[PDB]
RNA sequence: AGAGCACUUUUAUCACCGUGUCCCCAAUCUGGAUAUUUUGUGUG
C-alpha cells in the first residue's frame, strides 16, 4: 500500500470512523400475512430458457414505522462544514434507503 | 480511543376461466261495559 507508505505521508485512513449509526427496529409485531405469487414460464417457444415450469409462491408484508437513533459524534468534523451541511440535508432527504 | 465490525440480500412476475335456492300453503272458529244518581242556596 502506498509504496510502503513513505510517499503517502498521510494516515492510511485504516479505521477513521465518522457518523456512527445504529440499526433500525420496527414498532409493531408480525402476524403472519401472505400475498400470492405467480411467476409464469417466460415462454413455451423462446430460445431463452423457461425454467422448465411455472410455480406459485407466497410473500408476507406488514405496515409499520421504524424508530431510529442517529448517534452523530465527533468535534473534529470542522474541516469541511459544507460537506457536513450537505450530509445533513441528504439525511433530511432520505428516500429509497432499503434496496428492496 | 472497545481482539481494526462496513464494501451483497441483490434484479423481473394478472389465482386465472363458466354457474336461476329452486317448486305448493286461510290464523282459522264464538262474545249486550254492563247496574243507580235534583248544580241545589238567596241579592232595588
Automatic annotation (TrEMBL):
<protein>
    <submittedName>
        <fullName>Fruiting body developmental protein R-like protein</fullName>
    </submittedName>
</protein>
Amino acid at each position: 500500500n502506498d509504496a510502503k507508505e513513505m510517499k503517502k505521508l498521510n494516515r492510511p485512513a485504516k479505521r477513521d470512523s465518522i457518523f456512527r449509526c445504529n440499526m433500525a427496529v420496527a414498532v409493531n409485531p408480525y402476524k403472519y400475512d401472505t400475498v400470492f405469487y405467480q411467476s409464469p414460464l417466460n415462454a413455451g417457444d423462446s430460445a431463452w430458457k423457461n425454467s422448465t415450469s411455472s410455480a406459485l409462491l407466497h410473500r408476507e408484508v406488514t405496515h409499520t414505522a421504524f424508530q431510529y437513533p442517529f448517534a452523530l459524534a465527533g468535534k473534529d468534523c470542522a474541516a469541511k462544514p459544507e460537506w457536513v451541511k450537505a450530509l445533513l440535508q441528504a439525511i433530511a432527504e432520505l428516500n429509497g434507503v432499503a434496496g428492496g
